[PDB]
Amino acid sequence: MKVAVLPGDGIGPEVTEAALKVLRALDEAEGLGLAYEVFPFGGAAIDAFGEPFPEPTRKGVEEAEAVLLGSVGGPKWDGLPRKIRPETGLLSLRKSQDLFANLRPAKVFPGLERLSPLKEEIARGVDVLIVRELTGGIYFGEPRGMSEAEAWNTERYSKPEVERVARVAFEAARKRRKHVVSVDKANVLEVGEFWRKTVEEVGRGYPDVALEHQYVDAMAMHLVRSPARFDVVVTGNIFGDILSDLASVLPGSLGLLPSASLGRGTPVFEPVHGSAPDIAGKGIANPTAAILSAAMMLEHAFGLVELARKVEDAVAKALLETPPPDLGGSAGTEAFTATVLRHLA
Amino acid sequence: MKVAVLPGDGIGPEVTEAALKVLRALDEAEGLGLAYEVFPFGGAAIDAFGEPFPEPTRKGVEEAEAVLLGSVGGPKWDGLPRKIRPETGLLSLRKSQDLFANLRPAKVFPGLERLSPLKEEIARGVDVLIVRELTGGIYFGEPRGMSEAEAWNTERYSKPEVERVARVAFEAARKRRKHVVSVDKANVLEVGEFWRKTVEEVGRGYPDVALEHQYVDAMAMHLVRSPARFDVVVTGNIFGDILSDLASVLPGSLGLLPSASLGRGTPVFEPVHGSAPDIAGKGIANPTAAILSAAMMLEHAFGLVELARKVEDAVAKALLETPPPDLGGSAGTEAFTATVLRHLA
């Protein structure tokens, strides 16, 4: 199990090490053959190397089986040339490994329905994975322009772009509850219609996985009214962006959320939360998102789904047993990682 | 006050007459100079005339100051040629009057936070009006197509299309709480950027109204986390469609929602709910949406905002005092219209 570990900035070192504590603990207990090396990325790399993604890290990410990424970014680097800012190294990293699917799961863990914006009864059992196409669609479409008189942008998708994101949806669903919802605007848009028939054609290779389709405006409505009804959700890039952010607020605790970017090259697992420089070194940073990113790595980079589940369960019990300051408790980083390991043992 | 009344199908006759009872009651009490004539539309018109929008109604809508529209649609007409279906007469009606802005308000009335999907504390005080651009954007953009290899669609807007929907937002905000949020994707899209600077230029003529801008994916997140923060929301057509449906589920009682379509010609005020043929003639249909459409008519077609508010208040008190079957009570159509009139007197 070859991991490139890119802690980054701020709380990045702290939360990344908490996830490595879970992983080393599983490696001793099951013999996963863990091997990892820590590499400079982000602001630390700009300061030490002069660019956020230097060639040592490029090579190390190139040679690894997965990246456990921390958090990148800081005011010190915010004014730099776009070429070398922290935010841009994240895009260089995605590009180098041709990652075309962002996976953002939102889950209301047992006993934390209290944190949801939705009423308990709706929040109970939500566990949905949003698969967002990353490389195409309107942010990248041509033709595009603006004049004094008008502006234009093109939502364009080819059969390969849809097909590849559809297979990561289908494959992900097999590792969870065997249901996929593809979301489109097939009733008004050619893109919609084309997307739908390409996912339905791809669906055929996955007989063991159910597929239905929803129009995006009905899908936003269901994500507030009955989000517990969904397992995996797949859609294009801008709708994936709108629907991953919609689903992200449903647990009501944004710092808990893990992320993964999957593609042709080395996959990247990271927390959705930023580098939170303001509390770096205090040992209060909530590691839940970084430990859950480690769990997504086991599931999606090594196929160790059952291990991923076990880690999630330990996290779930820990959030109840010694809630972090974010959930109104007092358990600092170490203390919280400890009760996860304590449930893991 | 010249009104063309188009009751339509199913519960259309029943709920439309309940709204006319409120209006005749205000007309006697204040001397509004109410004048209305009832015209065939929808399925009733297909059956009597052979088309859902016949020339008598076209002319009557042409000569009126506002349309109070009921609900249109029925299985009997669902198989007909697209040219003459009920759904298509609604589009012919919009076209004839060049209505370019759909206004959908979602409001959690006092004491009905219980019905919301969101926790009480978030649902309390939500009252947001979504203004959706109706004529342009991607559903209508050229170029558009599909081949075996790819599909394409164009999100295109000209300075006039944005400018006109922006002024109905600004004007609507003046009649409520003096704040507008315009929503875009200005950070990635040319359309976004262009939309933003055209609304900010239009904002200048409305010094008495505040303007801020939000990216759509952040705006979906806020509509679940703090929707009470917003007065009027304006955006393009597909985002207006996604965000009007998102906000519509927040009261948790879809049958209550009024709608208005505003433009160059005669404005149309209607309930969001369909014709509900199954309960037509039973006198159980909830009139709240049709009475609230009458109130939106007073506000947006005649500028009688204070009267509109008074009607809304009577509705609010009535929903608490004699809740309809939909809110778990027993008050049928008549009974509920009566306690509105009783608060209105």
From Swiss-Prot, chains A, B:
The reaction(s) this protein catalyses: (2R,3S)-3-isopropylmalate + NAD(+) = 4-methyl-2-oxopentanoate + CO2 + NADH
Q: Required cofactors, per record?
A: Mg(2+); Mn(2+)
UniProt-annotated site: Important for catalysis, residues: Y139, K185
EC supergroup of this enzyme: oxidoreductase
One of the Pfam families matching this protein, by short name: Iso_dh
Question: For this protein, what is any one GO molecular function term?
Answer: NAD binding
Give the matching PROSITE patterns.
IDH_IMDH (PS00470)
Q: Which family does it belong to?
A: Belongs to the isocitrate and isopropylmalate dehydrogenases family. LeuB type 1 subfamily.
- What PANTHER family does the record point to? 3-ISOPROPYLMALATE DEHYDROGENASE
Q: Indicate what this protein is called per its UniProt record.
A: 3-isopropylmalate dehydrogenase
